[PDB]
């Protein structure tokens, strides 16, 4: 492949908790970040999707943190998405997605500038951990949760 992700989370390294959301009726929208560092990001956004806020999140957790980093999304597009991009690389029957081209390709030029990435997907849930927390913070102002 062009690169390999992690099978299993990296010890000692910090996890970036991203989300994003997003309004079909106005276009706004929100994607951040919580660690478990105790760092924290939001960016407000306008013209954009809700998969545009997923992809946006990942892209801050890439360009704020170290050579190796975990991160932990809920967003299956999300993940499936880049995890593709990287698998099907320079290979035959690859064709590119028209959707989000030009975020998906930034954020790959960040990946394989890492030395080692975990990447992984959780259900959307309730409780007090790390995917609630920046759920909640993008979701301010931009739905009801
Ligand atoms: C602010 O309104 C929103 O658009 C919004 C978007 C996502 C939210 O939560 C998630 O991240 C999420 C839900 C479903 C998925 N998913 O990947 O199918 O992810 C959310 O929680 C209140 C609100
Ligand atoms: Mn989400
Ligand atoms: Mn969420
Ligand atoms: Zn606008
Ligand atoms: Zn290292």
Do not use: C
Not at 15 to 22: I, S
Not at 83 to 104: A, E, F, M
Not at 109 to 130: D, R, S, T
């Amino acid at each position: 492949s062009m690169y390999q992700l992690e099978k299993e989370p990296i010890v000692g390294a910090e996890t970036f908790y991203v989300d994003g959301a997003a309004n079909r009726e106005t276009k706004l929208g929100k994607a951040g970040y919580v660690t478990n560092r105790g760092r924290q990001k939001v960016v407000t956004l306008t013209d954009t999707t809700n998969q545009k806020t997923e992809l946006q999140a990942i892209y801050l957790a890439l360009q704020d943190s170290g050579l190796e980093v975990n991160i932990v999304t809920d967003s299956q597009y999300a993940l499936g998405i880049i995890t593709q991009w990287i698998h099907n690389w320079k290979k035959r029957g690859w064709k590119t997605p028209v959707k989000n081209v030009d975020l998906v390709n930034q954020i790959i030029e960040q990946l394989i500038k890492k030395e080692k990435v975990y990447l992984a997907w959780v259900p959307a849930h309730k409780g007090i951990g790390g995917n609630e927390q920046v759920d909640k913070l993008v979701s301010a102002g931009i739905r009801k949760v």
